[PDB]
Design a binder for these strands. Structure first.
Lengths: 266, 102, 102, 277, 63, 143, 125, 213
RNA sequence: CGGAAGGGCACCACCAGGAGUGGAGCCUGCGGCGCGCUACACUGACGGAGCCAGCGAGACCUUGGCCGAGAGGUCUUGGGAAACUCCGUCGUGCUGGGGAUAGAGCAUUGUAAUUAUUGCUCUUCAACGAGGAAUUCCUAGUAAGCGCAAGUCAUCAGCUUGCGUUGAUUACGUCCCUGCCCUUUGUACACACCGC
């Protein structure tokens, strides 16, 4: 590489490495070809911090202009990065951009927290980051402890392949007229937790196997993941277990052939 | 812009603006008899007095791109096809004409 | 998929200042350096408030009716927040270093 | 930078009124991060925020058409200038230089947006055609054609959903990934002036010359709220935190601000548009 | 002659086979079910395609 | 707009200038050009005996002008290739200083070059101008 | 003064200093136009960066390359490396780093040794 | 319909750049003379081993293809051919001369058959790679031959080796030269003429395998 | 003392290929054995043209000038290699690949015996037509090709050792053979595995 690598991580499938160097560029290599698939600059999207005992600015110093910790996501598509700086930056591999940037702490007691001072000591730094193997949250171990960001709110309208006639009222009407498969598909197309929950607990046992047979392969992963994240803290055990058994029975070969796609789900 | 002339054991390529000996062919043993270009203007074919014609690309005398053995009698006339790109015709002292594919 | 909220803080279950119990007695509020951690005892869970302060929290208090939370750092900077939604309502500035709130 | 002359008037007078505007924060203090498209001007200006000054880049259209629309990319490096003649020029902001040029509309381009991923770009003009381009490559993914002329476009990059305010008094919500109309909001009795998405992407607030401000719940596709204001609202936006509504009316120098009770609690979603009205 | 294609699925190690020759299990490309244990000579790795003049025969060890 | 052999190729320029010198005629070639050997390491005289002397003269002019001043010994060092002593391995052999000096004297008599202090052989101004003229000629030779 | 950047390319034992300045768009090597590199089969091996990235950039940029040491092949590889590095350095210093990254991506996609040397350090078993 | 304008001032350079150079810009060819598109491997099981995907100007990449086990499979096929060509006592270490030979050979292939030199090369390789072969089972002294299959990389290696040795053998002591003899070899191999050394040898190997399978 | 079972490693083994010696000439170490260098040509030879290195720093080198085909000599100054590449000639014939040897001529070196050595030139054109039996060596800037420089206490001057240049094909697996080596009290510490 062009300069001192100092952090490394590896695609969960096991084909690529992502290495952060001291210029602050996250290069990404393909292993078997030993070649460079692509790199992501990071120099400008880093909010360093000024020091009260410094003589210079918080921009023109390379105090923490690089990332000492990298980690992938478990779809292999995203990267979390953190360093001695004040920022935790979330990039994504395949298109070489940043999705998000969090600021670790606003606390002027901690040293590198002021960008412009208002007219030895505890500094702020992220010593190591990781995603979660449930891929709904990630943790960053920093000077102030183990911060844990999560998505378990899901207050967000993130629909998928909608169409004009897919509405919550239409889903309820589907339930009343007993096309449980159609109701579940429309529930996911809307992609809203409460509607998913309602239809899921609505459909009956003597018909679960038919639905599990007829769910489309696009929605196998989303349904598996939802069932898992619901069955942790839900009390309807054999409801969830009949569901999972029916799912595996109806579609097992597909999951075996694309194990890497159903990783977090399984 | 160019034309080929037969002579004693020698085939000469001349230009049009310059009208000078542009290319030299002397890899024959005896005097040549016929010279003909192809429709594509790359291959010139020469019928010699050995009964084996030599066809090769223009502007590359240092290659005998093809040496086709006709009858033992010396070959007289050799021509390309016009419409076709890859057929040749020859006539020798054997009173028989030969059609040849590359 | 690309949205994350600060949902928890692990380590440092208590850093400085007042510790309090909730009305129902089911929840313990602790001040961590900037933020406030809530430990829900009967359901065995934890939680941490999204908002931060500017310096270390110096005192906390919970309204008896279990609605409001005042929290003051070391310079009168006080933030008054709601629970049943977990949002910051206002933030006022008591100019001298507070010592206790009730 | 060349150190050459600027040829113009010796006395100072301010720019024409600012018609369109776009701004990003991803690279503040490093170069310009605001484009303003001025009224009846054949080029847009750059503005720098942290310096609070006008930057050193002017963005022409190279088509002799006024700048009807501008936009700017989430990475903060690209600014787009959509003419009144269909020329969609794409400029690089650090060096204020020209990088690309697109030509699909023959009427005035009235809205540009580029995904929060810098992959797809959507354009919408008065002639009634919407053009889905790729931006990483330089091809055309698709080209839809609605009924009436498009007035304006608001893009929500979290969910890849953008809404076009039309002339037959409708909003049309179209999603970029699958390239087709998902929702069609009817109800405004008059020209639609401004509209905007919720940070969570569940609501559209639309203000129209019937002195009305409505809020549509997208999932049910229905108006859950309608307010009759005295002065028509000439602009409307949310704060990135879904807790302030900033609106501007036709009279008064101010900017009215609104709090979000639905932020502090729940709100029923029952269509009530004609119900009140 | 009618030849057939196959995809290697697993190289079979620790079988005592003559140097240079290697055991291998293939599954036919045309129909994904049926699999044959063949021998190969060159360097071979998993998940590449290999040509059979015969389908019926199955390789044995080669001492 | 002002070119030079620095902008022209080597072989094309040498051939063109050699032809120009053939046509011009006044070069005063020596009488034994057709027997001389050009190197003790060579083993048969040059093939094109009619103008190889002119080709050598043109190459000398190119070398001097690419350089600035060169002696006959420097020319001999530059031109003299390696030999083949057979069963024993090879060793480096200088060129024909005699031919180099008839070339050099002929170029002085023509006026292409002028003499050079610190001892040496430099290019003359008129020769430089004519060299640029012929370089432009062979550049726009493409019509 | 004038914008100028200077880079080095290095094959086996060939060094190549590449000077880049804003100019009329000429590429000279050893005082001669680049169209006259020596081995004449590797003319395209050295033309690589220009046709990889386009030429209008070179139309605004002026380039000067001096080479010393190594053989024919090593010198050629040094030249191409020097040109590629110098071009990217200039685009980094005087124009947008957006185009810097596009250039670097295109170069590394085509052949990475355009940018980073292939230091063939040995291997003992 | 729709267009993208990328170049605005027509490109001029203070150093003259030949026109074939700007066409090479428009699309990379080989030797600036032949495109790689529509060059497909007419035989499955062997694509992803014979590589013509990524374009190349001259077959002189110095990439490290002998470190790991199948970087040969990642090499461009033409460079592999030229390297195999530059193989004999008096030939070692003249890659430039090998390149010249390959260039003249390609030109000659086009002149004789108009279609495409590189397509001809690829077709010849695919056609001439053997398909079965007999190892020498000692049997404890009863030396016999046993028929086994052959992996695609070995097929490619042997195809190239057969062609190269055939050309060198057929032009060792003969008025022909290596360039034209290689062209003849390649053309007849694409034909499957059975008059080429390569096809003859492949048939002999496969016949032996067929016999004592 | 012997046997069995299990596991590892190797260009003294398998497997794939490459390159040699052995034929001829030359040189020279061991006494017939063995090591170097030049050949058997067309991926060449020949002729013009193009030019790209690095190690090396204790009457001498020399830049430049004058003649001489060459070799060489004469007058003045101070203490940038080959293979390679571009065009041109040659063509398959022990021919132009190969230059042994022989003859003649031209200069240099010491010296005086018309002594010897060196270099150039002419003419003379031998063996050698790719090297049996065998046999050794070899996995990446590696085999092999090409030149240059120094002789730094041993060893080397028809040679040692450095440095630069050009740069591959085929394995990168396997214990099947040929060997060789290890183990047959888990000893240590969870889980699992194994169980004279």
């Amino acid at each position: 590489v062009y300069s001192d690598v100092l952090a490394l991580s590896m695609r969960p499938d096991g084909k690529e490495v992502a290495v952060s160097t001291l210029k602050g560029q996250i290069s990404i290599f393909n292993i078997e070809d030993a070649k460079q698939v692509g790199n992501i600059d990071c120099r400008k999207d880093i909010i360093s911090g000024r020091f009260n005992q410094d003589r210079f600015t918080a921009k023109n110093s390379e105090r923490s202009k690089f990332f000492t910790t990298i980690h992938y996501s478990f779809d292999g598509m995203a990267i979390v990065a953190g360093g001695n700086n004040n920022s935790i930056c979330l990039y994504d591999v395949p298109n070489e951009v940043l999705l998000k940037r969090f600021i670790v702490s606003r606390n002027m007691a901690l040293n590198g927290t002021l960008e412009f001072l208002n007219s030895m000591r505890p500094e702020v730094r992220v010593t190591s980051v990781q995603f979660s193997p449930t891929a709904n949250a990630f943790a960053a171990a920093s000077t102030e402890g183990l911060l844990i960001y999560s998505t378990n709110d899901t207050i967000l309208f993130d629909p998928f392949d909608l169409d004009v006639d897919v509405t919550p009222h239409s889903t309820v009407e589907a339930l009343r007229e007993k096309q449980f498969l159609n109701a579940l598909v429309m529930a996911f197309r809307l992609n809203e937790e409460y509607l998913i929950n309602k239809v899921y607990e609505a459909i009956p046992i003597k018909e679960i196997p038919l639905v599990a047979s007829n769910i489309p392969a696009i929605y196998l992963p989303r349904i598996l993941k939802f069932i898992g994240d619901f069955a942790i803290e839900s009390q309807h055990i054999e409801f969830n277990l009949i569901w999972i058994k029916a799912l595996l029975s109806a579609s097992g070969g597909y999951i075996n052939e694309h194990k890497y796609l159903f990783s977090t789900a399984m | 812009h160019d034309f080929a002339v037969t002579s004693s054991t020698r085939v000469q390529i001349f230009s049009s603006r310059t009208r000078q000996v542009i290319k030299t062919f002397s890899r024959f043993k005896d005097v040549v008899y016929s010279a003909s270009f192809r429709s594509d203007g790359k291959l010139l074919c020469a019928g010699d007095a050995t009964g084996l014609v030599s066809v090769y690309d223009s502007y590359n005398p240092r290659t005998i791109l093809l040496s086709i053995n006709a009858s033992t009698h010396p070959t007289h006339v050799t021509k390309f096809h016009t419409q076709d790109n890859k057929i040749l015709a020859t006539a020798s002292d054997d009173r028989v004409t030969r059609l040849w594919d590359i | 998929k690309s949205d994350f909220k600060f949902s928890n803080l692990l380590g440092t279950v208590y850093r400085q200042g007042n510790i309090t119990f909730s009305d129902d007695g089911k929840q313990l509020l602790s001040p961590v350096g900037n933020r406030v951690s809530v430990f829900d005892l009967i359901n065995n869970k934890s939680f941490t408030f999204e908002y931060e302060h500017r310096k270390n929290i110096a005192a906390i208090d919970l309204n008896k009716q279990g609605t409001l939370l005042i929290s003051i750092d070391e310079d009168g900077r006080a933030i008054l927040v709601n629970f049943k939604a977990r949002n910051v309502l206002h933030h006022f500035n008591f100019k001298e270093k507070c010592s206790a709130v009730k | 930078q060349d150190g050459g002359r600027v040829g113009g008037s010796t006395i100072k007078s301010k720019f024409p009124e600012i018609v369109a505007l776009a701004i990003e924060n991803a690279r503040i203090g490093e170069w310009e991060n605001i484009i303003t498209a001025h009224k009846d001007e054949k080029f847009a200006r750059t503005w720098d925020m942290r310096n609070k000054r006008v930057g050193r880049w002017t963005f022409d259209t190279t088509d002799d058409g006024f700048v009807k629309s501008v936009a700017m990319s989430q990475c903060g490096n690209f600014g787009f200038i959509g003419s009144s003649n269909g020329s969609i020029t794409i400029y690089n902001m650090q060096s204020g230089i020209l990088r690309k040029k697109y030509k699909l509309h023959k009427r005035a381009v009235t809205g540009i947006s580029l995904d929060g991923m810098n992959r797809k770009m959507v354009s919408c003009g008065l002639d009634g055609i919407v053009g889905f381009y790729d931006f990483n490559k330089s091809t055309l993914l698709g080209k839809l054609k609605l009924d009436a002329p498009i007035t304006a476009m608001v893009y929500h990059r979290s969910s890849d959903l953008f809404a076009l305010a039309l002339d037959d008094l409708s909003i049309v919500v179209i999603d970029a990934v699958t390239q087709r109309v998902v929702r069609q909001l009817w109800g405004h009795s008059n020209r639609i002036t401004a509209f905007d998405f919720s940070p969570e992407g569940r609501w559209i607030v639309s203000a129209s010359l019937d002195s009305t401000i409505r809020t549509w719940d997208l999932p049910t596709g229905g108006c859950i709220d309608g307010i009759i204001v005295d002065n028509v609202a000439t602009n409307v936006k949310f704060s990135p935190n879904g807790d302030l509504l900033a609106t501007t009316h036709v009279t008064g120098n101010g900017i009215c601000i609104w709090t979000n009770r639905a932020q502090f609690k729940t709100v029923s979603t029952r269509t009530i548009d004609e119900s009140e009205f | 002659t009618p030849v057939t294609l196959a995809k290697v699925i697993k190289v079979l190690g620790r079988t005592g086979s003559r140097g240079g020759v290697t055991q291998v299990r293939v599954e036919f490309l045309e129909d994904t079910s049926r699999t044959i244990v063949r021998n190969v000579k060159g360097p071979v790795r998993e998940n590449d395609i290999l040509v059979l003049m015969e389908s019926e025969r199955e390789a044995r060890r080669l001492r | 707009p002002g070119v030079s052999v620095r902008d022209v190729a080597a072989q094309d320029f040498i051939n063109a200038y050699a032809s120009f010198l053939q046509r011009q005629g006044k070069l005063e070639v020596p009488g034994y050009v057709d027997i001389v050997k050009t190197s003790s390491g060579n083993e048969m005289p040059p093939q094109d005996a009619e103008g190889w002397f002119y080709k050598r003269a043109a190459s000398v002019a190119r070398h001097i002008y690419m350089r600035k001043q060169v002696g006959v010994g420097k020319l001999n060092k530059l031109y003299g290739g390696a030999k083949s002593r057979g069963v024993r391995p090879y060793k480096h052999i200088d060129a024909s200083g005699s031919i180099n000096r008839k070339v050099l004297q002929a170029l002085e008599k023509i006026g292409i070059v002028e003499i050079s202090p610190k001892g040496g052989r430099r290019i003359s101004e008129n020769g430089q101008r004519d060299l640029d003229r012929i370089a432009a000629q062979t550049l726009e030779e493409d019509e | 003064a004038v914008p100028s950047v200077q880079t080095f390319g290095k094959k086996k034992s060939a060094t190549a200093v590449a000077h880049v300045k804003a100019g009329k768009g000429l590429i000279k090597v050893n005082g001669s136009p680049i169209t006259l590199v020596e081995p004449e089969i590797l003319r395209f091996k050295v033309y690589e960066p220009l046709l990889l990235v386009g030429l209008d950039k070179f139309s605004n940029i002026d380039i000067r390359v001096r080479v010393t040491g190594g053989g024919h092949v090593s010198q050629v590889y040094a030249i191409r490396q020097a040109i590629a590095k110098g071009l990217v350095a200039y685009h980094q210093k005087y124009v947008d780093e957006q185009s810097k990254n596009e250039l670097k991506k295109a170069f590394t996609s085509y052949d990475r040794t355009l940018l980073i040397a292939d230091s063939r350090r040995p291997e003992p078993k | 319909d729709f267009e993208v304008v990328e170049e605005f001032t027509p490109v001029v350079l203070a150093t003259p750049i030949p026109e074939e150079v700007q066409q090479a810009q428009t699309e990379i060819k080989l030797f600036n003379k032949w495109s790689f598109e529509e060059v497909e491997v007419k035989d499955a099981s062997l694509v992803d081993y014979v590589q013509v995907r990524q374009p190349i100007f001259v077959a002189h990449t110095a990439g490290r293809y002998a470190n790991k086990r199948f970087r040969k499979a990642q090499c461009p096929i033409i460079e592999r051919l030229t390297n195999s060509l530059m193989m004999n006592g008096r030939n070692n270490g003249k890659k430039l001369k090998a390149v010249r030979i390959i260039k003249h050979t390609l030109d000659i292939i086009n002149v004789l058959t108009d279609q495409n030199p590189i397509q001809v090369v690829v077709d010849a390789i695919t056609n001439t790679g053997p398909r079965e072969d007999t190892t020498r089972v000692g049997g404890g002294g009863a030396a016999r031959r046993q028929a086994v299959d052959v992996s695609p990389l070995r097929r490619v290696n042997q195809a190239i080796a057969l062609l190269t040795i055939g050309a060198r053998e057929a032009a060792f002591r003969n008025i022909k030269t290596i360039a034209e003899t290689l062209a003849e070899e390649l053309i007849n191999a694409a034909k499957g003429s059975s008059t080429s050394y390569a096809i003859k040898k492949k048939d002999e190997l496969e016949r032996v395998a067929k016999s004592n399978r």
